[PDB]
Amino acid sequence: KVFERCELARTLKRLGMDGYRGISLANWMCLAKWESGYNTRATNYNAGDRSTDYGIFQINSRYWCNDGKTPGASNACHLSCSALLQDNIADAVACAKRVVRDPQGIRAWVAWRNRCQNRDVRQYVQGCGV
């Protein structure tokens, strides 16, 4: 599924993402935009450590979900990585929350660092009534 900008914003808000652990909705919108371009079935195989980034937030197999093929991986969100490729993002949002309940917070994702930190993210939720 490829969400429209404002469509995603309302859904994330509805799912309790506005300010979860200090993170604004516009920060999450900025992450998704740069991670998968609002695409729920985006995946990225990282041949280096044999892991894959799944879904709209591009959550990595080594730490967050189980795909059975990542060497010495972990499953913190306790989900099958298929749960992160659904059109219904409820599980992906629940896992992204688990990720930010970690020391780095939203900083866990390097693309957030590169394109959202100290960047005007307000533009991602303008006109969405959120």
Is there a catalytic annotation at residue 7? no
Is there a catalytic annotation at residue 53? yes
State the catalytic residue, choosing from 7, 18, 35, 67: 35
State the catalytic residue, choosing from 4, 7, 53, 91: 53
Token code pair at residue 11: 């859904």
Token code pair at residue 94: 């629940």
Sorted by sequence, the CB contacts under 8 Å of residue 79 that are 6+ apart come out as 64, 65, 66, 91, 95
Please state, in angstroms and rounded to a whole number, the distance separating the CA atoms of residues 115 and 127. Answer: 21
Cβ atoms of 73 and 63 within 8 Å: the answer is: yes
- At how many Å resolution was this determined? 2.0
The total number of structural domains that make up the chain: 1
> Closest by alpha carbon to 75, among 67, 64, 84?
64
Q: To the nearest 10°, report the CA torsion of 87, 18, 123, 41.
A: -20
> Closest by alpha carbon to 112, among 29, 48, 4, 54?
29
Domain containing 89 equals: 1-130
Please state, in angstroms and rounded to a whole number, the distance separating the CA atoms of residues 110 and 71. Answer: 22
Token code pair at residue 107: 């900083």
Residue 124, classed as helix, strand or coil, is: helix
> C-alpha 72: how far from its chain's center?
22
CATH (domain of 80) = 1.10.530.10
Q: Say how many C-beta atoms besides its own lie within 10 A of residue 47's C-beta.
A: 6
